[PDB]
XYZ file of N, CA and C in Angstrom:
363
model
N 112.814 85.575 112.299
C 112.025 85.836 113.508
C 112.626 87.210 113.739
N 113.320 87.962 112.583
C 113.726 89.559 112.132
C 112.040 89.841 111.118
N 111.800 91.388 111.551
C 110.803 91.444 110.749
C 110.621 91.998 109.265
N 110.746 90.784 108.935
C 111.219 90.853 107.335
C 109.447 91.551 106.579
N 110.074 92.361 105.780
C 108.524 92.745 104.982
C 108.591 92.392 103.467
N 106.921 91.866 103.038
C 107.585 91.427 101.827
C 105.879 92.606 101.086
N 106.332 92.547 99.226
C 104.956 92.961 98.869
C 103.961 91.839 98.312
N 103.148 92.237 98.678
C 101.884 91.010 98.163
C 100.896 91.734 97.569
N 99.721 90.984 97.058
C 98.459 91.366 97.174
C 97.682 90.498 97.699
N 96.070 91.297 97.954
C 95.357 90.645 99.315
C 94.517 89.585 98.005
N 93.496 89.403 98.907
C 92.923 88.167 98.046
C 91.656 88.523 96.910
N 91.594 89.822 96.362
C 91.086 90.170 95.362
C 92.212 90.964 94.360
N 93.490 90.525 94.722
C 94.399 91.331 93.656
C 94.686 92.483 94.184
N 94.802 93.349 95.183
C 94.603 94.203 95.550
C 96.070 94.877 96.117
N 97.113 95.728 96.243
C 98.284 95.636 96.986
C 98.416 95.654 98.398
N 98.978 95.023 98.808
C 99.181 94.916 100.676
C 100.884 94.304 100.697
N 100.958 94.866 102.066
C 102.424 94.483 102.327
C 102.149 93.965 103.525
N 102.838 92.255 103.854
C 103.212 91.130 104.667
C 104.069 91.168 105.616
N 104.043 91.380 106.565
C 104.907 91.536 108.150
C 105.586 90.497 108.522
N 106.354 90.032 109.064
C 106.751 89.325 109.683
C 106.679 89.516 110.847
N 105.720 88.977 111.705
C 105.313 88.922 113.427
C 103.655 88.834 113.609
N 103.385 88.310 114.590
C 101.932 88.240 114.907
C 101.360 89.591 115.392
N 100.120 89.615 115.127
C 99.530 90.570 114.799
C 99.612 91.971 116.318
N 99.670 91.419 117.059
C 99.758 92.331 118.781
C 101.034 92.825 118.610
N 102.221 91.977 118.036
C 103.622 92.390 118.120
C 103.386 93.491 117.107
N 103.213 93.591 115.951
C 103.260 94.132 114.995
C 102.534 95.356 115.004
N 101.299 95.394 115.934
C 100.542 96.654 116.438
C 101.584 97.498 117.271
N 101.992 97.036 118.247
C 102.872 97.708 118.903
C 103.995 98.253 118.599
N 104.351 97.474 117.567
C 105.758 98.446 116.979
C 105.301 99.154 115.555
N 103.750 99.646 115.290
C 103.701 99.982 114.456
C 104.081 101.732 114.684
N 103.702 102.189 115.751
C 103.588 103.578 115.299
C 104.922 104.059 115.578
N 105.605 103.219 116.348
C 107.387 104.032 116.559
C 108.044 103.613 115.163
N 107.522 102.582 114.273
C 108.078 101.986 112.982
C 107.779 103.472 112.166
N 106.275 103.904 112.047
C 105.868 104.554 111.233
C 106.262 105.841 111.201
N 106.559 106.754 112.627
C 106.540 107.571 112.871
C 108.382 108.118 111.813
N 108.905 106.729 112.008
C 110.503 107.078 111.118
C 110.266 106.996 110.016
N 109.188 107.217 109.409
C 108.991 106.811 107.652
C 107.979 108.330 107.317
N 107.427 109.311 108.309
C 107.006 110.532 108.404
C 105.626 110.280 108.246
N 104.816 109.046 108.858
C 103.581 108.567 109.524
C 103.415 108.859 110.742
N 102.693 110.063 110.878
C 102.013 110.308 112.609
C 100.576 109.907 112.294
N 100.432 108.999 113.713
C 99.447 107.644 114.002
C 98.412 108.708 114.777
N 97.368 109.222 114.113
C 96.535 110.450 114.660
C 95.663 109.526 115.531
N 95.206 108.327 115.127
C 94.098 107.344 116.056
C 94.155 105.940 115.386
N 93.987 105.330 116.433
C 93.817 103.897 115.754
C 92.723 103.022 116.863
N 92.828 102.338 116.435
C 91.472 101.161 117.201
C 91.943 99.745 116.705
N 92.169 99.215 117.506
C 92.529 97.924 117.397
C 91.633 96.884 116.717
N 90.164 96.686 117.280
C 89.411 96.015 117.463
C 88.839 95.900 115.928
N 89.030 97.214 114.795
C 88.916 97.135 113.401
C 90.351 96.960 113.042
N 91.587 96.890 113.354
C 92.650 96.800 112.795
C 92.434 98.067 111.847
N 92.374 99.280 112.174
C 92.617 100.134 111.944
C 93.418 101.678 112.326
N 94.631 102.212 111.733
C 94.799 103.170 112.061
C 95.078 104.150 111.278
N 94.584 105.437 111.773
C 94.649 106.646 110.880
C 96.095 107.314 110.798
N 96.766 107.675 109.577
C 97.523 108.120 110.025
C 97.846 109.237 108.900
N 98.838 110.305 109.032
C 99.065 111.507 108.159
C 100.448 111.298 108.017
N 100.704 111.791 106.546
C 102.288 111.024 106.095
C 102.615 112.385 105.364
N 103.393 113.016 105.309
C 104.113 114.030 104.944
C 105.976 113.733 104.496
N 106.083 113.623 103.264
C 107.495 112.383 103.423
C 108.470 113.125 103.938
N 109.552 112.341 103.570
C 111.082 112.891 104.577
C 111.597 113.547 103.399
N 112.494 114.814 103.991
C 113.363 114.929 102.787
C 114.694 114.146 102.811
N 115.102 114.192 101.274
C 116.325 113.360 100.837
C 117.192 112.782 101.837
N 117.623 113.946 102.796
C 118.515 112.872 103.643
C 118.271 112.758 105.107
N 116.781 112.992 105.140
C 116.115 111.963 106.195
C 116.074 110.353 105.658
N 115.452 110.660 104.355
C 115.331 109.381 103.524
C 117.027 108.345 103.904
N 117.629 109.013 103.310
C 119.338 108.607 103.462
C 119.266 108.107 104.590
N 119.243 108.683 105.672
C 119.347 108.227 107.381
C 118.158 106.870 107.398
N 117.235 107.177 107.058
C 116.213 105.995 107.123
C 117.019 104.487 106.995
N 117.199 105.070 105.796
C 118.177 103.734 104.424
C 117.362 103.536 103.699
N 116.569 104.424 102.938
C 115.637 103.687 101.872
C 115.108 104.917 101.373
N 114.542 105.082 99.963
C 114.205 106.166 99.212
C 112.637 105.900 99.323
N 112.429 107.614 98.912
C 111.420 107.917 98.928
C 110.351 107.175 98.126
N 109.333 107.013 98.708
C 108.372 105.477 97.945
C 107.253 106.047 97.483
N 107.639 107.280 96.344
C 106.302 107.808 95.620
C 104.976 107.998 96.401
N 104.539 108.329 97.133
C 103.571 108.420 97.850
C 103.054 109.932 98.172
N 101.707 110.317 97.648
C 101.898 111.496 98.115
C 101.338 111.621 99.455
N 101.509 113.364 99.917
C 101.479 113.427 101.422
C 100.175 113.531 101.332
N 99.455 113.535 103.199
C 97.963 113.440 103.222
C 98.049 112.297 104.111
N 96.711 112.239 104.301
C 95.823 111.483 105.004
C 95.679 109.561 104.485
N 95.863 108.756 104.886
C 95.576 107.592 105.026
C 94.899 106.706 106.398
N 94.647 105.681 105.679
C 94.087 104.767 106.786
C 94.970 103.314 106.382
N 95.132 102.674 107.318
C 96.071 101.703 107.723
C 95.429 100.307 108.349
N 95.274 99.475 107.753
C 94.359 98.624 107.823
C 95.214 97.343 108.003
N 95.353 96.513 109.371
C 96.477 95.893 109.481
C 95.567 94.705 110.270
N 95.939 93.346 109.349
C 95.243 92.080 109.835
C 96.160 90.942 110.394
N 95.504 89.818 110.411
C 96.328 88.996 111.491
C 95.703 87.623 110.300
N 97.587 87.725 110.581
C 97.932 86.167 109.665
C 98.704 85.287 110.544
N 98.718 85.063 111.992
C 99.219 84.565 112.475
C 100.772 84.370 113.180
N 101.119 83.988 112.448
C 103.062 85.094 112.478
C 103.159 85.740 111.766
N 102.226 85.955 110.636
C 102.760 87.242 110.062
C 101.560 87.882 110.251
N 101.507 89.199 110.158
C 100.712 90.588 109.913
C 100.265 90.681 108.575
N 99.078 91.335 108.264
C 99.341 92.331 106.735
C 99.130 93.779 106.936
N 99.953 94.852 106.108
C 99.259 95.930 106.081
C 98.645 96.086 104.561
N 97.726 97.267 104.699
C 97.080 97.961 103.661
C 96.658 99.212 103.834
N 97.279 99.868 102.993
C 97.320 101.254 102.668
C 96.235 101.981 102.403
N 95.287 102.639 102.535
C 93.686 103.329 101.862
C 93.371 104.681 101.887
N 93.846 104.868 100.693
C 93.115 106.280 100.998
C 92.115 107.218 101.435
N 91.954 108.313 101.531
C 90.543 108.679 102.256
C 89.119 108.223 100.968
N 89.456 107.932 99.814
C 88.412 107.943 99.156
C 87.566 106.176 98.726
N 88.588 105.408 99.750
C 88.793 103.976 99.659
C 89.643 103.266 98.737
N 90.760 103.952 97.770
C 91.501 103.383 97.602
C 92.804 103.156 97.190
N 93.200 101.381 97.371
C 94.613 100.986 97.244
C 95.567 102.252 96.704
N 96.721 101.882 97.485
C 98.305 102.613 96.244
C 98.328 101.408 95.319
N 98.819 101.831 94.206
C 99.227 101.279 93.271
C 99.950 100.310 93.671
N 100.209 98.876 92.986
C 101.400 98.061 93.188
C 102.573 98.385 93.551
N 103.042 99.320 92.549
C 104.223 100.176 92.340
C 104.736 100.703 93.794
N 103.663 101.282 94.288
C 103.964 102.165 95.410
C 104.188 101.652 96.658
N 103.179 100.267 96.501
C 103.360 99.073 97.885
C 104.596 98.691 97.768
N 104.818 98.358 96.568
C 106.553 97.669 96.457
C 107.770 98.784 96.881
N 107.439 99.804 96.862
C 108.456 100.816 97.263
C 108.359 100.820 98.888
N 107.283 101.059 99.352
C 107.021 100.599 100.565
C 107.781 99.615 101.575
N 108.027 98.122 100.875
C 109.211 97.041 101.026
C 110.145 97.798 101.762
N 111.118 98.559 101.203
C 111.933 98.957 101.743
C 112.266 99.934 102.844
N 110.795 101.011 102.506
C 110.713 102.318 103.694
C 110.301 101.287 104.955
N 109.213 100.362 104.794
C 109.171 99.564 106.365
C 110.380 98.414 106.374
N 111.058 98.064 105.563
C 112.306 97.298 106.106
C 113.257 98.023 106.823
N 113.494 98.997 106.564
C 114.116 100.326 107.024
C 113.567 100.549 108.016
N 112.384 101.063 108.366
C 112.061 101.149 109.339
C 112.018 100.293 110.821
N 111.473 99.521 110.839
C 111.583 98.290 111.684
C 113.125 97.878 111.803
N 113.935 98.097 110.958
C 115.627 97.745 111.396
C 115.620 98.819 112.394
N 115.521 100.252 111.680
C 115.914 101.411 112.845
C 115.428 101.021 114.195
N 113.839 100.587 114.330
C 113.644 100.077 115.636
C 114.808 99.017 116.501
N 115.145 98.090 115.567
C 115.297 97.046 116.199
C 116.946 97.153 115.543
């Protein structure tokens, strides 16, 4: 019932996260959680499950205060796709070229989002 995060892959084998919580619950939590990890939501459109984010890594000190290590993402603009899995939601980052993250980048986002959703709660 806590907002657990797990690393997974999509139906095509590409990296994604799976969050415990229904789609609108997670949608409503996302901006606040994103803020904790250095991701600014510049726009979102729920009917598309899409968010536009601009990311600037935290400082080491700030990663420490969050409780997770730098996930090895480049600074810049990303699309975040959010999907409905009933009691869970999926999250998939896409860069502007339409490329997913590497699986290891995604894996490293587990701790980051676990920390962020914990920081909220």
